[PDB]
Amino acid sequence: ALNQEFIEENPPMKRVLAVQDEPQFIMDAFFDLKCVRPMPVYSVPGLIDHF
Amino acid sequence: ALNQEFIEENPPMKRVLAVQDEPQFIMDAFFDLKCVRPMPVYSVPGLIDHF
Q1: In Å, how far is B47's CA from the nearest CA of chain A?
Q2: How many angstroms separate the CA atoms of B46 and A2, rounded?
Q3: A34 to A37, A40, B29, B38: CA distances (angstroms)
Q4: Touching check for A44 and chain B: CB below 8 Å?
Q5: Is the CB of residue B25 less than 8 Å from the CB of residue B17?
Q6: Contact between residue A50 and residue B49 where contact means Cβ atoms under 8 Å apart
Q7: Is the dihedral of CA A44, A45, A47, A49 positive or negative?
Q8: Which residues contact A29 (CB under 8 A, 6 or more apart)?
Q9: Which residues, at least 6 apart from B49, have a Cβ–Cβ distance to it below 8 Å?
Q10: ∠A44-A47-A48 over CA atoms, to 5°?
Q11: Chain A residues touching B46 at Cβ < 8 A
């Protein structure tokens, strides 16, 4: 029927894969952020009246 | 003998000097240092968080 079970992505990976009962994808990901932030790059303790 | 008593400097000043029993040299010395130092030229008390 045209419903939730029909439109949700559900490819039959279990039949095209040689090894049974292990996760389909193993992934390594790396996130390289350049950040400008409202804080110093290293904070030294001190400066009581300041900020 | 060639020993400590022979090589130590020991000029016979007591015989060439007119006044007996006063120190041979009277000296005035003055040491003019220009210093660059890791401190301010005058320190005012204060600045608690700082340095």
Answers
A1: 9
A2: 77
A3: 10, 14, 63, 37
A4: no
A5: no
A6: yes
A7: positive
A8: none
A9: A46, A47, A48, A49, A50
A10: 130
A11: none
d(CA B12, CA B34): 39
Alpha-carbon gap, residue A17 to A26, rounded angstroms? 14
Cα–Cα dist A48/A34, whole Å? 30
Question: To probe the interface with B, which of A43, A44, A49, A51 has the most B CB atoms within 10 Å?
Answer: A49
Nearest to B49 by CA among A43, A48, A42, A51: A48
Deposited experimental method = cryo-EM
Q: Minimal CA–CA distance to A50: which of B4, B49, B16?
A: B49
CB contact under 8 A, A50 and B48: no
Buried b (16+ CB within 10 A) or exposed e, A11-41: eeeeeeeeeeeeeeeeeeeeeeeeeeeeeee
Residue A44 tokens, joined: 């030294």
